[PDB]
Design a binder for these strands. Structure first.
Length: 69
DNA sequence: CGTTGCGGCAAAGTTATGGGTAAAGTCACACGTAGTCACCATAATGAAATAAGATCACTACTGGGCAGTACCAGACTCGAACTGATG
């Protein structure tokens, strides 16, 4: 499951406005690149698109240790 | 005439460069990045205070009028008496 968290991060989370990727090294965060001033998503839409990802994209995607979706 | 060195011609040989494809590596998922003094100008009262103003009290200076007094007649009114007409 933990690796699947990173799969979700790279496939769905890190491709969205407000992706708190820069904040890993806070020394490089500026008021122009702070995700807080860039946030656009809500809870409902983020949840529904994460569910769409989980139950269709990763659902039909082939797996290494499985040889099928 | 034959031999020998030299030079053109055209594959052939060697580097280089931008493409494609499987396969060895690479690295984040492991609860977490935002969070906190320092900074000096402006509004904004509320208090401190004003600088002049307001009034009291006293001192001195200078206009200035009222209750009362007084005379010299002119003029109207009328006691008191005189005098003439009369029934």
């Amino acid at each position: 499951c933990e690796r699947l968290f990173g799969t979700s991060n790279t496939q769905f989370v890190h491709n969205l406005l407000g992706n708190t990727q820069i904040t890993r090294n806070v020394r490089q965060v500026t008021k122009s690149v702070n995700p807080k001033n860039l946030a656009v998503w809500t809870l409902g839409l983020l949840y529904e698109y994460l569910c769409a990802w989980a139950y269709e994209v990763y659902d039909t995607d082939e797996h290494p240790a499985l040889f099928q979706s």
